[PDB]
Amino acid sequence: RYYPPALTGLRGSHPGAFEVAHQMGWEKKTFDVDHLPIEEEYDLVVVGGGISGLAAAWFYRERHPAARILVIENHDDFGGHAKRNEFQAGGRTILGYGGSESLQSPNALYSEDAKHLLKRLGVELKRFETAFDTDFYPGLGLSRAVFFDKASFGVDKLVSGDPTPMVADEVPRDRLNARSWRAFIGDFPLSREDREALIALYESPRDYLAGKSVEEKETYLAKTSYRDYLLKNVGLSETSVKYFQGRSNDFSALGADALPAADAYAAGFPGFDALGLPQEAQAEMDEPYIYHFPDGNASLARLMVRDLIPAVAPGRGMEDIVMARFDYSKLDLAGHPVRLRLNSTAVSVRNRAGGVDVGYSRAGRLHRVRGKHCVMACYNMMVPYLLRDLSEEQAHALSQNVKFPLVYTKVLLRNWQAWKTLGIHEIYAPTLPYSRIKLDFPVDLGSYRHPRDPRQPIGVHMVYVPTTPNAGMDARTQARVGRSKLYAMSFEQLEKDIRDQLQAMLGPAGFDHRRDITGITVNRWSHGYSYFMNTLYDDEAESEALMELARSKVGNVAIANSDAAWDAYAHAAIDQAVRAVREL
Ligand SMILES: Cc1cc2nc3c(=O)[nH]c(=O)nc-3n(C[C@H](O)[C@H](O)[C@H](O)COP(=O)(O)OP(=O)(O)OC[C@H]3O[C@@H](n4cnc5c(N)ncnc54)[C@H](O)[C@@H]3O)c2cc1C
Numbered sequence: 001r002y003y004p005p006a007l008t009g010l011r012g013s014h015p016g017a018f019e020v021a022h023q024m025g026w027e028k029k030t031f032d033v034d035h036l037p038i039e040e041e042y043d044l045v046v047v048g049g050g051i052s053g054l055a056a057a058w059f060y061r062e063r064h065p066a067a068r069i070l071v072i073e074n075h076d077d078f079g080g081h082a083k084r085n086e087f088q089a090g091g092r093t094i095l096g097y098g099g100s101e102s103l104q105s106p107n108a109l110y111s112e113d114a115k116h117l118l119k120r121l122g123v124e125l126k127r128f129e130t131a132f133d134t135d136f137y138p139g140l141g142l143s144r145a146v147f148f149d150k151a152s153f154g155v156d157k158l159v160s161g162d163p164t165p166m167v168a169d170e171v172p173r174d175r176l177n178a179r180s181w182r183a184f185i186g187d188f189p190l191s192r193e194d195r196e197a198l199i200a201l202y203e204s205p206r207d208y209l210a211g212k213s214v215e216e217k218e219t220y221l222a223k224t225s226y227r228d229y230l231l232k233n234v235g236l237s238e239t240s241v242k243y244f245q246g247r248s249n250d251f252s253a254l255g256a257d258a259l260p261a262a263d264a265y266a267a268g269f270p271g272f273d274a275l276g277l278p279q280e281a282q283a284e285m286d287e288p289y290i291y292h293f294p295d296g297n298a299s300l301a302r303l304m305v306r307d308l309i310p311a312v313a314p315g316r317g318m319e320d321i322v323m324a325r326f327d328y329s330k331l332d333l334a335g336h337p338v339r340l341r342l343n344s345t346a347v348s349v350r351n352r353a354g355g356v357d358v359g360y361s362r363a364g365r366l367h368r369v370r371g372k373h374c375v376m377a378c379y380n381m382m383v384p385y386l387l388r389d390l391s392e393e394q395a396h397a398l399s400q401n402v403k404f405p406l407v408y409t410k411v412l413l414r415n416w417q418a419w420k421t422l423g424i425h426e427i428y429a430p431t432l433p434y435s436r437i438k439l440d441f442p443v444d445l446g447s448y449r450h451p452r453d454p455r456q457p458i459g460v461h462m463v464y465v466p467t468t469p470n471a472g473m474d475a476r477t478q479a480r481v482g483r484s485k486l487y488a489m490s491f492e493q494l495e496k497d498i499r500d501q502l503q504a505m506l507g508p509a510g511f512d513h514r515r516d517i518t519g520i521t522v523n524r525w526s527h528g529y530s531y532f533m534n535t536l537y538d539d540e541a542e543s544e545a546l547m548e549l550a551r552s553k554v555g556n557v558a559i560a561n562s563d564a565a566w567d568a569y570a571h572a573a574i575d576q577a578v579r580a581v582r583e584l
C-alpha cells in the first residue's frame with residue numbers, strides 16, 4: 001500500500017523529492033514544456049502541497065465552488081513541513097510530527113481568515129485544554145534538564161530542575177518541578193568563578209548599558225548579538241556563554257551568535273532585567289503551547305485534504321481525523337474536481353492567452369497542463385526557476401528568501417524508565433548536534449491515547465540544527481552552509497549522532513541504545529523555516545521592500561507560501577494563501 005506516514009528512516013525532504021529542483025537550482029538545467037500538448041485543464045493550478053498550497057486551493061474553492069483544481073507537490077506525501085510520522089509499538093500506533101509542530105499562540109495570532117478555516121474544518125481550539133495532558137509529566141515529578149558535554153565542559157553532566165522559562169511553553173510555570181538558580185547553576189560543570197557570574201546574572205541584574213538612553217539601548221541591542229552582549233557587556237567568560245549557545249537553535253534556527261540581543265530580550269533570555277527597557281506582546285508570550293495534534297500540524301494538512309478530496313478518508317472534525325485512514329490512490333482521480341499529484345516537480349509556469357501553462361516532472365518525464373489561474377505556494381527561492389515572466393528584479397527578490405535547515409528526529413523507545421529514573425521529560429544540550437531532546441507531548445484526541453506507562457514504548461522528539469556558531473557568518477550563510485553540511489551527511493551518519501547522544505545522556509541510568517531504540521525517523525528539512533529579517537545583518541526598510549517585491553502578482557500567477565511573509569508559521573502560510581486567492 002502507498003502510505004508515507006508509516007515510513008521510517010530518512011524522511012522530511014527524502015531522496016527523490018529534490019533531484020529535479022536541484023538540476024534547475026544547481027546545474028541550471030531548464031525543462032521547457034511549451035512544445036508538448038496540454039494534457040489537462042483546470043481553473044486553478046497550485047504549485048506546492050504544503051499548508052499554504054492546500055489553503056490556497058481551499059479558499060479558492062470557497063470562492064469558486066465548482067472550481068477544478070490541481071495541486072502539484074514534489075515530496076512523496078502532502079503537507080510540506082507538516083508531515084505525519086508513525087511507529088508500530090506493542091500492537092498499537094504511536095504518532096509523531098514530522099515538522100510543523102503546533103499552532104503558535106492561536107488566540108492571539110490567528111487572523112480571522114485562519115480562524116474561519118479552522119472552524120469550517122471543525123477545529124475547536126478550546127478542545128486542547130482537555131486533550132493536552134498538561135499535568136502528566138509534572139505530576140510524575142519530572143522536570144527539564146541541561147546536558148553538558150565532555151568536549152566543551154570537561155565532563156558529561158546532566159543537571160535537572162531547570163527553571164528557564166521558554167517562549168512556547170506547554171508547562172505552567174508553577175509546575176516546572178524546578179530549583180533555584182543558585183542550586184541549579186551550582187551543579188554546572190564550570191569553574192566556581194563562572195558559576196557565581198551566572199548566578200549573579202539572575203540574582204543581581206545590573207544596567208550593563210548604563211549611560212545610554214532607552215533608545216540607544218534598544219538600537220544597540222538590535223545590532224549586537226546575544227552572545228556578544230554577554231561577553232562584552234555582562235562580562236561572562238567564553239566558557240560561561242557556551243551554556244547559552246544552543247538555546248535558540250529550535251525557535252530561531254540559529255544559535256546565540258546570530259540571535260539579536262533585542263530578540264533574546266523578547267524571548268525571555270536573562271540579562272536585561274535592570275536595563276530599564278519597556279515591556280499584546282505578552283498576550284502571545286504567555287499563551288500555553290498546548291495546541292498540538294498528536295501528529296503536529298500534519299492534522300491541518302490532513303483535514304484540508306479530506307475536506308478538499310472527500311474520497312481520501314471518511315469522517316468530519318478534529319476528533320476523527322487523528323486515526324482516519326487516508327487512501328492515497330484516491331488523491332488524483334481523473335474528472336474529480338480537486339486533484340493532488342505527488343512526486344511531481346513543477347518546472348515551468350508561463351502566462352498565456354489569459355491563463356497559465358504549467359510544466360512538471362514526474363518519474364523523470366515532462367508534462368504540460370493549463371489552468372485559468374496559478375498560485376505559487378512552493379519555496380519562494382524555487383519560483384524564479386519556474387516562473388518565466390518574472391522581471392530580473394523580482395526573481396532576485398525571491399532569491400533572497402534563504403530558508404533555514406532543521407532536522408526533527410523521532411525516536412521510538414522500548415520504555416522510558418531511564419527518563420523516569422533521571423526525573424526528566426526534556427533535555428537542553430547547549431553545544432551538541434541535538435539541542436532539544438524530550439518525551440513527546442502527551443495529547444489524547446479522537447481514539448488516540450498518549451503513551452502513559454514507563455515500562456511500555458514511547459516516542460521521543462529531538463531537534464538538530466546544523467549551525468556554524470562563532471564564525472563571523474551572517475544568517476543567510478549559516479543557513480546555506482548548514483544545508484551543505486546536511487548534504488554531505490548519510491543516514492548512517494545521522495543515526496550515529498542520534499545514538500551517540502542518547503547513549504551519553506541516558507546511559508548512566510541504564511540506557512542501551514542498541515537494545516532500547518526500537519525505531520528512528522529523521523525528518524530532514526534542508527529547506528525549513530522561511531528567512532526572517534535579522535537586525536544584526538539586515539536593514540528593516542530594505543528587507544520589507546524586498547519582501548513585497550518578491551510576492552508581487554505576475555499576470556494570473558500569484559505568490560503564496562509562508563516564505564512570502566518572511567514568517568515561518570502555519571498561520572502565515574494560511575494568510576499568504578488567502579492573499580494569493582483574493583488577488584486572482
Ligand atoms: C521543523 C519545523 C517545525 C515547525 N514548527 C512549527 C510550529 O510549531 N508552528 C508553526 O506555526 N509553524 C511551524 N513551522 C513552520 C512551517 O514551515 C509552517 O507551519 C508550514 O508548514 C509552512 O507551510 P508552507 O506551505 O508555507 O511551506 P511548505 O509546506 O514548506 O512548502 C510547500 C511545498 O512546496 C514544495 N515545492 C517546492 N518546490 C516545488 C516545485 N518545483 N514543484 C512542486 N512543489 C514544490 C515543497 O517541497 C513543499 O513541500 C515549522 C517549520 C519547520 C521546518
Ligand code: HEM
Nearest residue numbers: 013014017018021022025381382399480483484486487526
Ligand atoms: C533533501 C535535501 C536537500 C538538501 C541537502 C539540499 C541542499 C541544498 C543546498 C546545499 C543548496 C545550496 C545552498 C542554497 O542555495 O540554499 C540548495 C539549493 C537549492 N535547493 Fe536544496 N536541498 C534539499 C532539498 C531540496 C528540495 C526538496 C528543493 C525543492 C523543493 C530544493 C530546492 C533547492 C533550490 C531551488 C536551490 C537553489 C536556491 C537558489 O539558487 O537560490 N532543495 N539545496
